[PDB]
Amino acid sequence: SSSVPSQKTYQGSYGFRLGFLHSGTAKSVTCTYSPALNKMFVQLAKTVPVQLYVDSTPPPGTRVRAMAIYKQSQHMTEVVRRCPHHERSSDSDGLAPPQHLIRVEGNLRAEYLDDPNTFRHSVVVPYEPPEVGSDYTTIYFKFMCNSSCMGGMNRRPILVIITLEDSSGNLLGRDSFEVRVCACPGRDRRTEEENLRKKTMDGEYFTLQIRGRERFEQFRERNEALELKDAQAT
Amino acid sequence: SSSVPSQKTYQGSYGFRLGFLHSGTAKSVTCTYSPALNKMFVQLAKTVPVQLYVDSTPPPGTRVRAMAIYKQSQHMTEVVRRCPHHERSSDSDGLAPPQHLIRVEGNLRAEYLDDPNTFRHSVVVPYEPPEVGSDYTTIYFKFMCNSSCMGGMNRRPILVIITLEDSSGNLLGRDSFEVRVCACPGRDRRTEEENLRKKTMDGEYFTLQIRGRERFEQFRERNEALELKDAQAT
Amino acid sequence: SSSVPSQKTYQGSYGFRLGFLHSGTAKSVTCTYSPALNKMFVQLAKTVPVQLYVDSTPPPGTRVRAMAIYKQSQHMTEVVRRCPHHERSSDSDGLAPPQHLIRVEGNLRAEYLDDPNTFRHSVVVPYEPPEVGSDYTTIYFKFMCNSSCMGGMNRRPILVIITLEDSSGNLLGRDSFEVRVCACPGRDRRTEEENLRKKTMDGEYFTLQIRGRERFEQFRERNEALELKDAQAT
Amino acid sequence: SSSVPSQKTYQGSYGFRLGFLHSGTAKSVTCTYSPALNKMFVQLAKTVPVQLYVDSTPPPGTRVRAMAIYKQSQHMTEVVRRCPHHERSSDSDGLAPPQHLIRVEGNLRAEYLDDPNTFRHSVVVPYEPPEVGSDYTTIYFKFMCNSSCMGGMNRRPILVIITLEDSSGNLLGRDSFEVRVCACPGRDRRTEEENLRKKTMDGEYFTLQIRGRERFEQFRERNEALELKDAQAT
DNA sequence: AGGAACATGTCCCAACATGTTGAGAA
DNA sequence: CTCAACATGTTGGGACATGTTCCTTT
Ligand SMILES: [Zn+2]
Ligand SMILES: [Zn+2]
Ligand SMILES: [Zn+2]
Ligand SMILES: [Zn+2]
């Protein structure tokens, strides 16, 4: 009640920042990212690949930490955790405590923390350099609850904070993205981007006609992302 | 689960890449390759010839490893293995462990690895130069499970990664192709190449509103570029 | 797992049976009963009045027990309990254990049992005679979970069994009705009674062949005979 | 070893037979019996009990055997067990061996064991006299595998031998019915009755037009019910 | 407080998917 | 060694299910 985890973006000296795959919005997609809202839509307990980018390799012993907080200010001080139901269910993973919302997949060096003061949960992993011929590293997350789970997130939007820190635990970089765990990411995603379009519509716009639905959605995706970089330029 | 090995193409210092041009005559193969999908269609336990291309002769001790991973991101962290039924089968030649999906044929120097940290399976063979009169080295594989095997791949599409490495295991080159092990390769290939065609024969147009003159310029050219390349499907 | 308690109607020596005729005025109830389904629609934790009818006054020590079981046979063996979230709620009045779904209201003699052999839950109260001027005894229930509560009933229809017994617990009578705890009782009732109607109004003509002259007569004396008795919408 | 037991409808002095609740060819189900085929279509691990009926209720202690045997004149020797895949799947129920096809939940009297010589699988339960306020008995059946699982029944038909046997285990009854555990008991059921009735249909056949998809099923829940009561040619 | 208008998890079933079997082609 | 017909588990997404928000109403 006297300290909330900072969510201010910060590239730092290593140009740290995140990247995500490109997905559709079909009623079959299990995970899909919206550059228009910097928000990930994923089904319960399904893999969420997050790409980590760097301009220069960080010092030895650098770790990456994932932590979730509530987006709305009236809930910001409330620790995000699993609901009574899903909490009362153990998984093959004997590493992550049954109360943690975020898990890391395929990494036995992962470590789950319960802050003794803030009581906030978080999972940390060693920073690994990109594979030879690659420009980024990628971590695979999982969210063990539906944003709607009663007794848990209870329909409250959450934000995921990814920090890059050194052996001492000092901040080296930080980025973030919103998350919504739901039954149909495709549907929910289309709905939100649809409500966003019918809003910031004002001014002089050039018109480009595109052939094909897939090609169009890519062009539209790259377009809405650019309109975001401007949304907060001043 | 287990971390995901890189699947990014990397020709490296030797311009490493794969080829799939092996006639039907001589060792009448029942498999077939589709360049339109970069996917091979083969039957369970049947020879699959793959061509290795390199610009200059690699150093002494170079090897060639083969590893299979699940294509879809929600399965990428799961290790690709054989199904219980086929695993306990006696189709084992001794050299290859009963749990490996990928096998090398006609090479007694092949070594099968069951990683102790990533739990991933793979098979390695010493790199061999092309035959006198050829500019490529052939290698023969065998897939011990149907892509549909329950308990196994379970109808989940897989991707085979071929990496070139030095005696130590350092990456020198990498390439890959999709694989589907079925009972009727010819059929399944027609169907999939057919579904691919229908996907690029839909003439529906969409309009996009672009803000900023320069931006429009960039997007337009991007489109004209894809446009002046649409007329070639004949 | 747990054996399934009998749900067969048995009026017994006292002609025991239930009734659901309680006006809206006085204790304005938000629940509603559908005789066309013998199913009660009520909201979470809201009073549900039920009438007890008997031909002759029962012996001293007679009690009335209430037990809920899942309707569908594939769930019948699962004990009906509250969900984790609502179970840890503070809506507990003390008398009733936090895990019980069914509660008795306005009766401090009510006893809650958590069977040590069947693990089934139930609540009992001493049988009380009708009020001067009435031929039925009223009892008030409270359902502490929504039929949709995950971790709990999980959208699975339940059935409430009311049994009349002697001081020892021997069966003297039994009756029952279905129950659905939802947020909008009125709506859900209309929908279900509506789906019931459409089920008994289909107007598509199909064909049926027979291989006899006698037996045919029976299915002949009923066919063009049921299409007559329809003095409801004509 | 021995051989395959009888399956000739032999009620005996005590008489014996069973029954199944209402089951329509509607694909809106998870199980259904086709009297015109004597085949119990049911999904995987979905409880599907059968009614116990007996005129002269045998002496307490008597038991009802239930076994599975292939109806094909070549596999009748092979024991009916679970596929290698599902075998790994160790269900919570430790009462039934993780290799037995049949199960019976919510019944401590459940008996499971491997034959000492032939090494067969069987389940036996004590004939519980119709309890207070009833007239018959009901046991909860299951099938932990599909009739198509490879490494198991492998697309091979089976019969559930239900013979009432005294405490000792001496013959007393003999009833039976074929089973086809699948994923679509509805479709599958009709896809058989079709080709079934497709044969032998030349002669005097009256007509009858029934209006009402449900009524049609009602005139079928009796007419066809007499195709086993009137059709006594053999 | 009764009730459209959301918000959001499940279900239905016609495709679709895919190993079998078998008769015919070169 | 190719197709046609089957035999059979899985899927895609519109329809349905179901708690929540908030204006209009006694
Ligand atoms: Zn939850
Ligand atoms: Zn297999
Ligand atoms: Zn609840
Ligand atoms: Zn099986």
PDB file of N, CA and C in Angstrom, chain C residues 1-4 6 8-10 73-77 171 174 199-213 215-216 219-220 222-224 226-227 230, chain D residues 21 30 46-49 105-108 131-135 140 200-201 204-216 219-220 222-224 226-227 230-231:
ATOM      1  N   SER C   1     -15.170 -40.608  -5.145  1.00  0.00           N
ATOM      2  CA  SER C   1     -16.532 -40.899  -5.684  1.00  0.00           C
ATOM      3  C   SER C   1     -17.473 -41.309  -4.548  1.00  0.00           C
ATOM      4  N   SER C   2     -18.778 -41.310  -4.821  1.00  0.00           N
ATOM      5  CA  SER C   2     -19.760 -41.699  -3.811  1.00  0.00           C
ATOM      6  C   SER C   2     -21.017 -42.297  -4.449  1.00  0.00           C
ATOM      7  N   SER C   3     -21.579 -43.326  -3.811  1.00  0.00           N
ATOM      8  CA  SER C   3     -22.779 -43.981  -4.328  1.00  0.00           C
ATOM      9  C   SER C   3     -23.859 -42.931  -4.543  1.00  0.00           C
ATOM     10  N   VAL C   4     -24.861 -43.272  -5.347  1.00  0.00           N
ATOM     11  CA  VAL C   4     -25.946 -42.349  -5.632  1.00  0.00           C
ATOM     12  C   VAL C   4     -27.203 -42.607  -4.803  1.00  0.00           C
ATOM     13  N   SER C   6     -31.023 -42.654  -3.705  1.00  0.00           N
ATOM     14  CA  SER C   6     -32.232 -42.824  -4.503  1.00  0.00           C
ATOM     15  C   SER C   6     -32.943 -41.512  -4.750  1.00  0.00           C
ATOM     16  N   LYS C   8     -36.111 -41.743  -6.373  1.00  0.00           N
ATOM     17  CA  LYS C   8     -37.438 -42.181  -6.771  1.00  0.00           C
ATOM     18  C   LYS C   8     -38.530 -41.657  -5.841  1.00  0.00           C
ATOM     19  N   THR C   9     -39.596 -41.121  -6.424  1.00  0.00           N
ATOM     20  CA  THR C   9     -40.699 -40.598  -5.637  1.00  0.00           C
ATOM     21  C   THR C   9     -41.331 -41.716  -4.845  1.00  0.00           C
ATOM     22  N   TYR C  10     -41.679 -41.426  -3.595  1.00  0.00           N
ATOM     23  CA  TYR C  10     -42.280 -42.402  -2.695  1.00  0.00           C
ATOM     24  C   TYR C  10     -43.130 -41.668  -1.671  1.00  0.00           C
ATOM     25  N   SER C  73     -26.524 -38.616 -15.512  1.00  0.00           N
ATOM     26  CA  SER C  73     -25.885 -39.838 -15.025  1.00  0.00           C
ATOM     27  C   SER C  73     -24.366 -39.829 -14.997  1.00  0.00           C
ATOM     28  N   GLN C  74     -23.716 -39.099 -15.909  1.00  0.00           N
ATOM     29  CA  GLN C  74     -22.252 -39.088 -15.905  1.00  0.00           C
ATOM     30  C   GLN C  74     -21.647 -38.290 -14.770  1.00  0.00           C
ATOM     31  N   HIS C  75     -22.489 -37.583 -14.017  1.00  0.00           N
ATOM     32  CA  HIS C  75     -22.035 -36.777 -12.889  1.00  0.00           C
ATOM     33  C   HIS C  75     -22.661 -37.214 -11.559  1.00  0.00           C
ATOM     34  N   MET C  76     -23.700 -38.038 -11.648  1.00  0.00           N
ATOM     35  CA  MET C  76     -24.413 -38.513 -10.476  1.00  0.00           C
ATOM     36  C   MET C  76     -23.551 -38.972  -9.309  1.00  0.00           C
ATOM     37  N   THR C  77     -22.380 -39.528  -9.593  1.00  0.00           N
ATOM     38  CA  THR C  77     -21.530 -40.020  -8.514  1.00  0.00           C
ATOM     39  C   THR C  77     -20.686 -38.942  -7.854  1.00  0.00           C
ATOM     40  N   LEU C 171     -36.482 -44.263   5.864  1.00  0.00           N
ATOM     41  CA  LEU C 171     -37.315 -43.570   4.890  1.00  0.00           C
ATOM     42  C   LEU C 171     -38.811 -43.706   5.148  1.00  0.00           C
ATOM     43  N   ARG C 174     -40.536 -39.531   0.144  1.00  0.00           N
ATOM     44  CA  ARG C 174     -39.535 -38.858  -0.665  1.00  0.00           C
ATOM     45  C   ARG C 174     -40.118 -38.217  -1.910  1.00  0.00           C
ATOM     46  N   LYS C 199     -40.131 -28.140 -28.711  1.00  0.00           N
ATOM     47  CA  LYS C 199     -39.853 -29.568 -28.724  1.00  0.00           C
ATOM     48  C   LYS C 199     -41.126 -30.385 -28.936  1.00  0.00           C
ATOM     49  N   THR C 200     -42.270 -29.808 -28.576  1.00  0.00           N
ATOM     50  CA  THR C 200     -43.550 -30.495 -28.723  1.00  0.00           C
ATOM     51  C   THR C 200     -44.457 -29.771 -29.716  1.00  0.00           C
ATOM     52  N   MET C 201     -43.862 -29.254 -30.787  1.00  0.00           N
ATOM     53  CA  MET C 201     -44.614 -28.535 -31.806  1.00  0.00           C
ATOM     54  C   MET C 201     -44.036 -28.777 -33.199  1.00  0.00           C
ATOM     55  N   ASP C 202     -42.930 -29.507 -33.290  1.00  0.00           N
ATOM     56  CA  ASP C 202     -42.322 -29.746 -34.597  1.00  0.00           C
ATOM     57  C   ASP C 202     -43.383 -30.078 -35.648  1.00  0.00           C
ATOM     58  N   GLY C 203     -43.244 -29.482 -36.828  1.00  0.00           N
ATOM     59  CA  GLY C 203     -44.209 -29.712 -37.885  1.00  0.00           C
ATOM     60  C   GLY C 203     -43.668 -30.296 -39.176  1.00  0.00           C
ATOM     61  N   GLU C 204     -42.622 -31.116 -39.085  1.00  0.00           N
ATOM     62  CA  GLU C 204     -42.051 -31.748 -40.273  1.00  0.00           C
ATOM     63  C   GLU C 204     -42.595 -33.163 -40.403  1.00  0.00           C
ATOM     64  N   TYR C 205     -43.044 -33.514 -41.603  1.00  0.00           N
ATOM     65  CA  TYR C 205     -43.592 -34.841 -41.840  1.00  0.00           C
ATOM     66  C   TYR C 205     -42.528 -35.827 -42.308  1.00  0.00           C
ATOM     67  N   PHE C 206     -42.379 -36.918 -41.559  1.00  0.00           N
ATOM     68  CA  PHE C 206     -41.416 -37.963 -41.891  1.00  0.00           C
ATOM     69  C   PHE C 206     -42.166 -39.229 -42.306  1.00  0.00           C
ATOM     70  N   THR C 207     -41.425 -40.226 -42.776  1.00  0.00           N
ATOM     71  CA  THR C 207     -42.035 -41.481 -43.199  1.00  0.00           C
ATOM     72  C   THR C 207     -41.592 -42.659 -42.325  1.00  0.00           C
ATOM     73  N   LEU C 208     -42.473 -43.645 -42.192  1.00  0.00           N
ATOM     74  CA  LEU C 208     -42.182 -44.831 -41.395  1.00  0.00           C
ATOM     75  C   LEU C 208     -42.830 -46.056 -42.042  1.00  0.00           C
ATOM     76  N   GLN C 209     -42.017 -47.069 -42.331  1.00  0.00           N
ATOM     77  CA  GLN C 209     -42.507 -48.295 -42.955  1.00  0.00           C
ATOM     78  C   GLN C 209     -42.814 -49.371 -41.914  1.00  0.00           C
ATOM     79  N   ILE C 210     -43.787 -50.222 -42.227  1.00  0.00           N
ATOM     80  CA  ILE C 210     -44.189 -51.308 -41.339  1.00  0.00           C
ATOM     81  C   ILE C 210     -44.212 -52.608 -42.138  1.00  0.00           C
ATOM     82  N   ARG C 211     -44.173 -53.740 -41.445  1.00  0.00           N
ATOM     83  CA  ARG C 211     -44.195 -55.035 -42.118  1.00  0.00           C
ATOM     84  C   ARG C 211     -45.329 -55.907 -41.567  1.00  0.00           C
ATOM     85  N   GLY C 212     -46.428 -55.264 -41.175  1.00  0.00           N
ATOM     86  CA  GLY C 212     -47.563 -55.993 -40.633  1.00  0.00           C
ATOM     87  C   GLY C 212     -48.904 -55.314 -40.856  1.00  0.00           C
ATOM     88  N   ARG C 213     -49.980 -56.003 -40.485  1.00  0.00           N
ATOM     89  CA  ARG C 213     -51.334 -55.476 -40.648  1.00  0.00           C
ATOM     90  C   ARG C 213     -52.013 -55.255 -39.296  1.00  0.00           C
ATOM     91  N   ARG C 215     -50.174 -55.112 -35.824  1.00  0.00           N
ATOM     92  CA  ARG C 215     -49.363 -54.187 -35.041  1.00  0.00           C
ATOM     93  C   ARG C 215     -49.426 -52.790 -35.657  1.00  0.00           C
ATOM     94  N   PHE C 216     -49.541 -52.742 -36.982  1.00  0.00           N
ATOM     95  CA  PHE C 216     -49.631 -51.475 -37.697  1.00  0.00           C
ATOM     96  C   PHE C 216     -50.821 -50.689 -37.168  1.00  0.00           C
ATOM     97  N   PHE C 219     -50.131 -48.445 -34.049  1.00  0.00           N
ATOM     98  CA  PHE C 219     -49.404 -47.221 -34.366  1.00  0.00           C
ATOM     99  C   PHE C 219     -50.193 -46.441 -35.405  1.00  0.00           C
ATOM    100  N   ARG C 220     -51.418 -46.900 -35.644  1.00  0.00           N
ATOM    101  CA  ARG C 220     -52.316 -46.279 -36.603  1.00  0.00           C
ATOM    102  C   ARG C 220     -53.415 -45.613 -35.791  1.00  0.00           C
ATOM    103  N   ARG C 222     -52.989 -44.361 -33.035  1.00  0.00           N
ATOM    104  CA  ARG C 222     -52.356 -43.300 -32.261  1.00  0.00           C
ATOM    105  C   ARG C 222     -51.886 -42.144 -33.140  1.00  0.00           C
ATOM    106  N   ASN C 223     -51.441 -42.470 -34.349  1.00  0.00           N
ATOM    107  CA  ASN C 223     -50.956 -41.461 -35.286  1.00  0.00           C
ATOM    108  C   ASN C 223     -52.014 -40.412 -35.632  1.00  0.00           C
ATOM    109  N   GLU C 224     -53.021 -40.816 -36.402  1.00  0.00           N
ATOM    110  CA  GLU C 224     -54.092 -39.908 -36.803  1.00  0.00           C
ATOM    111  C   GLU C 224     -55.105 -39.697 -35.674  1.00  0.00           C
ATOM    112  N   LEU C 226     -53.581 -38.386 -32.397  1.00  0.00           N
ATOM    113  CA  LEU C 226     -52.899 -37.379 -31.587  1.00  0.00           C
ATOM    114  C   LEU C 226     -52.912 -36.025 -32.284  1.00  0.00           C
ATOM    115  N   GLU C 227     -53.129 -36.048 -33.595  1.00  0.00           N
ATOM    116  CA  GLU C 227     -53.183 -34.832 -34.393  1.00  0.00           C
ATOM    117  C   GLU C 227     -54.549 -34.166 -34.251  1.00  0.00           C
ATOM    118  N   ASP C 230     -55.566 -31.190 -29.837  1.00  0.00           N
ATOM    119  CA  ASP C 230     -54.685 -30.027 -29.905  1.00  0.00           C
ATOM    120  C   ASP C 230     -55.456 -28.746 -29.595  1.00  0.00           C
TER     121      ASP C 230
ATOM    122  N   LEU D  21     -31.828 -46.715 -20.529  1.00  0.00           N
ATOM    123  CA  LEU D  21     -32.719 -45.557 -20.561  1.00  0.00           C
ATOM    124  C   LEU D  21     -32.924 -45.030 -21.978  1.00  0.00           C
ATOM    125  N   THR D  30     -24.282 -38.538 -25.924  1.00  0.00           N
ATOM    126  CA  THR D  30     -22.946 -39.066 -25.675  1.00  0.00           C
ATOM    127  C   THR D  30     -23.031 -40.581 -25.551  1.00  0.00           C
ATOM    128  N   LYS D  46     -17.142 -42.147 -20.426  1.00  0.00           N
ATOM    129  CA  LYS D  46     -18.415 -41.532 -20.085  1.00  0.00           C
ATOM    130  C   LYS D  46     -19.378 -42.553 -19.497  1.00  0.00           C
ATOM    131  N   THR D  47     -19.649 -42.404 -18.204  1.00  0.00           N
ATOM    132  CA  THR D  47     -20.538 -43.295 -17.471  1.00  0.00           C
ATOM    133  C   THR D  47     -21.833 -43.584 -18.220  1.00  0.00           C
ATOM    134  N   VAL D  48     -22.119 -44.865 -18.422  1.00  0.00           N
ATOM    135  CA  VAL D  48     -23.335 -45.289 -19.107  1.00  0.00           C
ATOM    136  C   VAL D  48     -23.874 -46.555 -18.456  1.00  0.00           C
ATOM    137  N   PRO D  49     -24.606 -46.400 -17.339  1.00  0.00           N
ATOM    138  CA  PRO D  49     -25.194 -47.514 -16.592  1.00  0.00           C
ATOM    139  C   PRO D  49     -26.272 -48.295 -17.352  1.00  0.00           C
ATOM    140  N   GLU D 105     -17.916 -46.962 -11.385  1.00  0.00           N
ATOM    141  CA  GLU D 105     -17.656 -45.933 -10.381  1.00  0.00           C
ATOM    142  C   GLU D 105     -18.743 -45.832  -9.322  1.00  0.00           C
ATOM    143  N   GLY D 106     -18.376 -45.264  -8.178  1.00  0.00           N
ATOM    144  CA  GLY D 106     -19.316 -45.110  -7.083  1.00  0.00           C
ATOM    145  C   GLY D 106     -19.924 -46.434  -6.664  1.00  0.00           C
ATOM    146  N   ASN D 107     -19.067 -47.371  -6.259  1.00  0.00           N
ATOM    147  CA  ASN D 107     -19.513 -48.693  -5.827  1.00  0.00           C
ATOM    148  C   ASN D 107     -18.347 -49.477  -5.241  1.00  0.00           C
ATOM    149  N   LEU D 108     -18.173 -49.391  -3.927  1.00  0.00           N
ATOM    150  CA  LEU D 108     -17.082 -50.094  -3.264  1.00  0.00           C
ATOM    151  C   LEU D 108     -17.073 -51.608  -3.480  1.00  0.00           C
ATOM    152  N   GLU D 131     -33.449 -51.086  -3.408  1.00  0.00           N
ATOM    153  CA  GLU D 131     -33.552 -50.426  -2.108  1.00  0.00           C
ATOM    154  C   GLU D 131     -34.924 -49.791  -1.864  1.00  0.00           C
ATOM    155  N   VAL D 132     -35.112 -49.282  -0.648  1.00  0.00           N
ATOM    156  CA  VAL D 132     -36.361 -48.643  -0.237  1.00  0.00           C
ATOM    157  C   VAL D 132     -36.870 -47.647  -1.280  1.00  0.00           C
ATOM    158  N   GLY D 133     -38.125 -47.813  -1.685  1.00  0.00           N
ATOM    159  CA  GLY D 133     -38.707 -46.928  -2.676  1.00  0.00           C
ATOM    160  C   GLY D 133     -38.087 -47.119  -4.046  1.00  0.00           C
ATOM    161  N   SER D 134     -38.164 -48.344  -4.563  1.00  0.00           N
ATOM    162  CA  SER D 134     -37.615 -48.662  -5.877  1.00  0.00           C
ATOM    163  C   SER D 134     -38.162 -50.001  -6.370  1.00  0.00           C
ATOM    164  N   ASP D 135     -37.478 -50.610  -7.335  1.00  0.00           N
ATOM    165  CA  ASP D 135     -37.914 -51.894  -7.877  1.00  0.00           C
ATOM    166  C   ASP D 135     -36.838 -52.594  -8.713  1.00  0.00           C
ATOM    167  N   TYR D 140     -23.031 -48.454 -12.715  1.00  0.00           N
ATOM    168  CA  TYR D 140     -22.384 -47.477 -13.593  1.00  0.00           C
ATOM    169  C   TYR D 140     -21.232 -48.010 -14.434  1.00  0.00           C
ATOM    170  N   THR D 200     -33.112 -56.651 -46.894  1.00  0.00           N
ATOM    171  CA  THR D 200     -34.353 -57.315 -46.503  1.00  0.00           C
ATOM    172  C   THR D 200     -35.474 -56.294 -46.291  1.00  0.00           C
ATOM    173  N   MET D 201     -36.130 -55.906 -47.381  1.00  0.00           N
ATOM    174  CA  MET D 201     -37.220 -54.938 -47.307  1.00  0.00           C
ATOM    175  C   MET D 201     -38.200 -55.089 -48.474  1.00  0.00           C
ATOM    176  N   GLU D 204     -44.831 -56.567 -48.427  1.00  0.00           N
ATOM    177  CA  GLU D 204     -45.897 -55.661 -48.014  1.00  0.00           C
ATOM    178  C   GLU D 204     -45.409 -54.723 -46.918  1.00  0.00           C
ATOM    179  N   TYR D 205     -45.306 -53.437 -47.249  1.00  0.00           N
ATOM    180  CA  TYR D 205     -44.861 -52.416 -46.302  1.00  0.00           C
ATOM    181  C   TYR D 205     -45.770 -51.187 -46.355  1.00  0.00           C
ATOM    182  N   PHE D 206     -46.590 -51.012 -45.325  1.00  0.00           N
ATOM    183  CA  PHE D 206     -47.496 -49.872 -45.271  1.00  0.00           C
ATOM    184  C   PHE D 206     -46.717 -48.583 -45.079  1.00  0.00           C
ATOM    185  N   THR D 207     -47.420 -47.462 -45.193  1.00  0.00           N
ATOM    186  CA  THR D 207     -46.808 -46.149 -45.038  1.00  0.00           C
ATOM    187  C   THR D 207     -47.418 -45.414 -43.850  1.00  0.00           C
ATOM    188  N   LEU D 208     -46.706 -44.409 -43.350  1.00  0.00           N
ATOM    189  CA  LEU D 208     -47.179 -43.635 -42.209  1.00  0.00           C
ATOM    190  C   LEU D 208     -46.371 -42.346 -42.069  1.00  0.00           C
ATOM    191  N   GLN D 209     -47.041 -41.209 -42.235  1.00  0.00           N
ATOM    192  CA  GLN D 209     -46.385 -39.910 -42.126  1.00  0.00           C
ATOM    193  C   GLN D 209     -46.594 -39.298 -40.747  1.00  0.00           C
ATOM    194  N   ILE D 210     -45.512 -39.231 -39.976  1.00  0.00           N
ATOM    195  CA  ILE D 210     -45.553 -38.681 -38.625  1.00  0.00           C
ATOM    196  C   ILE D 210     -44.982 -37.258 -38.580  1.00  0.00           C
ATOM    197  N   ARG D 211     -45.752 -36.321 -38.034  1.00  0.00           N
ATOM    198  CA  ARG D 211     -45.287 -34.944 -37.922  1.00  0.00           C
ATOM    199  C   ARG D 211     -44.769 -34.668 -36.503  1.00  0.00           C
ATOM    200  N   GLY D 212     -43.500 -34.283 -36.414  1.00  0.00           N
ATOM    201  CA  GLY D 212     -42.893 -34.003 -35.126  1.00  0.00           C
ATOM    202  C   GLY D 212     -41.629 -34.816 -34.940  1.00  0.00           C
ATOM    203  N   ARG D 213     -40.479 -34.179 -35.147  1.00  0.00           N
ATOM    204  CA  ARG D 213     -39.187 -34.850 -35.011  1.00  0.00           C
ATOM    205  C   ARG D 213     -39.116 -35.683 -33.733  1.00  0.00           C
ATOM    206  N   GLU D 214     -39.819 -35.240 -32.693  1.00  0.00           N
ATOM    207  CA  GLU D 214     -39.826 -35.959 -31.425  1.00  0.00           C
ATOM    208  C   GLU D 214     -40.849 -37.085 -31.476  1.00  0.00           C
ATOM    209  N   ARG D 215     -42.029 -36.776 -32.007  1.00  0.00           N
ATOM    210  CA  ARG D 215     -43.093 -37.766 -32.123  1.00  0.00           C
ATOM    211  C   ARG D 215     -42.590 -38.929 -32.976  1.00  0.00           C
ATOM    212  N   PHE D 216     -41.855 -38.600 -34.037  1.00  0.00           N
ATOM    213  CA  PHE D 216     -41.296 -39.603 -34.942  1.00  0.00           C
ATOM    214  C   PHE D 216     -40.405 -40.554 -34.144  1.00  0.00           C
ATOM    215  N   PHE D 219     -42.692 -42.813 -31.996  1.00  0.00           N
ATOM    216  CA  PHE D 219     -43.289 -43.946 -32.697  1.00  0.00           C
ATOM    217  C   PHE D 219     -42.197 -44.952 -33.045  1.00  0.00           C
ATOM    218  N   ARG D 220     -40.956 -44.586 -32.737  1.00  0.00           N
ATOM    219  CA  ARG D 220     -39.803 -45.441 -32.993  1.00  0.00           C
ATOM    220  C   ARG D 220     -39.332 -46.082 -31.688  1.00  0.00           C
ATOM    221  N   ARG D 222     -41.030 -47.625 -29.790  1.00  0.00           N
ATOM    222  CA  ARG D 222     -42.040 -48.644 -29.520  1.00  0.00           C
ATOM    223  C   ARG D 222     -42.216 -49.596 -30.705  1.00  0.00           C
ATOM    224  N   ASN D 223     -42.347 -49.041 -31.909  1.00  0.00           N
ATOM    225  CA  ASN D 223     -42.521 -49.861 -33.109  1.00  0.00           C
ATOM    226  C   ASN D 223     -41.323 -50.783 -33.285  1.00  0.00           C
ATOM    227  N   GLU D 224     -40.135 -50.190 -33.351  1.00  0.00           N
ATOM    228  CA  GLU D 224     -38.917 -50.971 -33.500  1.00  0.00           C
ATOM    229  C   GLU D 224     -38.735 -51.827 -32.252  1.00  0.00           C
ATOM    230  N   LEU D 226     -40.889 -53.484 -31.025  1.00  0.00           N
ATOM    231  CA  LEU D 226     -41.681 -54.679 -31.282  1.00  0.00           C
ATOM    232  C   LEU D 226     -41.095 -55.499 -32.429  1.00  0.00           C
ATOM    233  N   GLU D 227     -39.960 -55.055 -32.957  1.00  0.00           N
ATOM    234  CA  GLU D 227     -39.298 -55.784 -34.034  1.00  0.00           C
ATOM    235  C   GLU D 227     -38.448 -56.889 -33.414  1.00  0.00           C
ATOM    236  N   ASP D 230     -42.165 -59.112 -31.902  1.00  0.00           N
ATOM    237  CA  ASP D 230     -43.048 -59.713 -32.898  1.00  0.00           C
ATOM    238  C   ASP D 230     -42.231 -60.592 -33.836  1.00  0.00           C
ATOM    239  N   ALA D 231     -41.027 -60.132 -34.164  1.00  0.00           N
ATOM    240  CA  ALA D 231     -40.133 -60.875 -35.045  1.00  0.00           C
ATOM    241  C   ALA D 231     -39.517 -62.038 -34.281  1.00  0.00           C
TER     242      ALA D 231
END
